[PDB]
Structures are given as C-alpha cells and as structure tokens.
C-alpha cells in the first residue's frame, strides 16, 4: 500500500489524512475518485446523516496507515446509520441506495477477527 495525502476536498479533515490507490472501486487516482464522490455533495451538505461523509470517504479514499498495512473498512454500524438517515431522502428524489454501498458487505463492529472504523 502506497500512502498519498488526500486531495479530494470532500474527504479532507475526516479524521485521517492519508489514503491509498486504487480504491475498492478500481479508481486509479484521487481525481477519478473525487469526481464521483463529489456528486454526493448535496446529501452531505443537507446533513441527512452525520455519518455519511466519513462512510463515503472511507471507501472512495480508504484510510492508509504506515503501521497497519491492511485495508481498514468502515464498521457496518457506520453504513447502517448513514443509510437510516439519507436513504429516505434519496428515495424521495428518485434514487435508491447504491449497490456498491450495501452495508451487508462490511464487517460488524466488535469482531475480534477483523477490525473496522467506527465513530
């Protein structure tokens, strides 16, 4: 994993400063990942969920740590809370919860075998 400073404006100041590429969506540069994640800016600025910005960024700009050389996904609870807040508002504007953001794919909190980020 090669760490690179996060340059995506939406993902700055989220709790960590370094990310790696490619992400799970096979984006090769932050410019490519940035262009997609920025489309979600109205949902972030409307504040349907306090957890939305961290959840989105934790996938498009996954955290990179010099000591922990392993992908660290968001805890499932982070995804579920973001879905609870924003999915109804998205649904009201004709958009379903994106398939790449399905919460079942993420590890649960407190599992001794796999670590995840929760706040």
């Amino acid at each position: 994993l090669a760490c690179q400073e996060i340059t995506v404006p939406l993902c700055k100041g989220i709790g960590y400063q370094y990310t790696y590429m490619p992400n799970q969506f096979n984006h090769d540069t932050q410019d490519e990942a940035g262009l997609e994640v920025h489309q979600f800016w109205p949902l972030v600025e409307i504040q349907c969920s306090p957890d939305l910005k961290f959840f989105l960024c934790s996938m498009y700009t996954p955290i990179c740590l010099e000591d922990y050389k392993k992908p660290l996904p968001p805890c499932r609870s982070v995804c579920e809370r973001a879905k609870a807040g924003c999915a109804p508002l998205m649904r009201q504007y004709g958009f379903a919860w994106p398939d790449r953001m399905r919460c079942d794919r993420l590890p649960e909190q407190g599992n001794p075998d796999t670590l995840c980020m929760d706040h």
Binding site: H38, Q39, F40, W41, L43, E45, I46, L89, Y93
Partner: protein, 89 residues
C-alpha cells in the same frame, strides 16, 4: 469619581461583548442547506455545473470561517484593552 470609572468600565465591557457579534455559523448552515435543497430538486445527483457550485460553497465556508477568525482576534483585542484600562485603577 473613581466609582464612575467602574460604571464606565462595565459599559465598555458590555459594548465590547457586542463587538464580537459572530453568530454567522448558525445562518451559514441554513444557507448551505438551502442550496443543497435546490441542488436536489434541480437533479444534480449539468454535472459540470454541480461540481462548480460545491467548490464555491467550500470557498464560501472558508470565507465564513475566515470572518469568524477575525472576530476572535477582535475579542482578543477587547480583552487586552480591558487589561490596560484596569491597570490605572
């Protein structure tokens, strides 16, 4: 006479309190939400226009935070004025 100063002093302290008005953070959040609502109804979720608006909103947020920073420097200055004014009495 010296007790008039203390009456004048609190008026300075009272007026100094009003000087660092700030209060912009509450109004800013409503404005950004209003733009986000418009953005949603316009269907931004055309794509190029949406990206520029968000970039402008972040600069606006920086401007608001910048304005808030100077307000704190004002509050730092009103404190220092109260300090030296108290030194005579």
């Amino acid at each position: 006479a010296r007790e008039q100063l203390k009456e004048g002093m609190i008026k300075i302290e009272e007026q100094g309190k009003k000087l660092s008005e700030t209060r912009t953070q509450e109004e800013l959040q409503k404005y950004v939400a209003a733009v986000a609502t418009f953005a949603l109804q316009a269907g931004f979720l055309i794509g190029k226009i949406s990206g520029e608006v968000y970039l402008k909103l972040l600069d606006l947020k920086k401007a608001v935070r910048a304005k808030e920073k100077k307000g704190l420097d004002i509050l730092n200055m009103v404190g220092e004025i109260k300090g030296t004014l108290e030194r005579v009495y």
